[PDB]
Subunit: 160 residues, 2 copies
């Protein structure tokens, strides 16, 4: 059903260079990968300070190619299964582009992955801006962020 | 406060080259411009068939530079005014990136422009999918598309 995700990336007004993606399903399943293919040299101060140091070591199994990340996601999202895929992110526009651009043009996205990401910030407001726990101090790690989104979704919808 | 928008574009898995944008305000004002800087030859065949033939004739003052559009939108969104700007689109992730990239990186976005666009399909599904008017015949005109969004929005919230 529902997957909560987050991406980190280098975004320059022209392209979104994927750094990492973290995806967490309602059932406990977790997926995380860092792209072997971005150029850390292009990163700004913010990404250098808050994103790059949080990444795993060089010989970690979490470093994958963009082709590998896509294949992994086709499997993790159970694209050929019978459940409807519902994607969720907090402030998700660039994240949705960065995710879908793993298959290239909007055209090439599996007919089974939705063409929009539901916006958890919009749900939060809708239900009367309820108090959320503090963001974790590990944030800017795509997996920690994705996990925290599932947490807030559970809290927000807890009397729906 | 509330703006409903849509863009047409050429997107290749790497860049989103803006063709056009229409923005309609809840108060009734409308904006529409077509970019003189996208390369029509780079268009995939779907865009060639559905989007390009609906563009105004070349001599139209509707044709504006990217910098003109950005300046038009700063004034049209009253980004220096008093009001909260709230942006709305229907499945508008790509639309949102295309709009922000008129300023540049997300770094360069004016402080009062929201960092996210609300997703009108999500609201529609949250309100239980109420019955909508049939499609405009002139769809994939961004202004048309944007006008319909406000129309749906008003329906959903009545
Ligand atoms: O103040 C901010 C917040 C986010 N980002 C960019 O957005 C991506 C998503 O960050 P989080 O939020 O997730 C980051 O990897 C980074 O490139 C910035 O540049 N500045
Ligand atoms: O079947 C479709 C639908 C949309 N688009 C692209 O999405 C943009 C926005 O279309 P609408 O949605 O507005 C178009 O300008 C075009 O690049 C396609 O390529 N194929
Ligand atoms: Mg993010
Ligand atoms: Mg998120
Ligand atoms: Mg993050
Ligand atoms: Mg559209
Ligand atoms: Mg210009
Ligand atoms: Mg449109």
């Amino acid at each position: 059903v529902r997957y909560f995700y987050d991406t980190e990336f280098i975004e320059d007004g022209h392209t979104i260079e994927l750094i990492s993606i973290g995806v967490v399903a309602e059932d406990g399943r977790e997926y995380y990968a860092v792209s072997t293919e971005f150029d850390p040299e292009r990163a700004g101060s913010w990404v250098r300070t808050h994103v790059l140091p949080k990444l795993p070591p060089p010989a970690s199994q979490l470093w994958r190619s963009r082709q590998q990340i896509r294949l992994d996601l086709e499997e993790f999202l159970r694209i050929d299964g019978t459940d409807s895929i519902e994607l969720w992110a907090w402030v998700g526009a660039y994240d949705h582009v960065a995710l879908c651009q793993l298959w290239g043009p909007m055209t090439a996205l599996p007919p089974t992955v939705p063409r929009f990401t539901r916006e958890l910030r919009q749900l939060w407001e809708d239900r009367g801006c309820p108090r959320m726990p503090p963001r974790p101090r590990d944030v800017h790690d795509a997996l920690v962020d994705a996990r925290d989104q599932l947490r807030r979704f559970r809290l927000i919808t807890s009397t729906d």
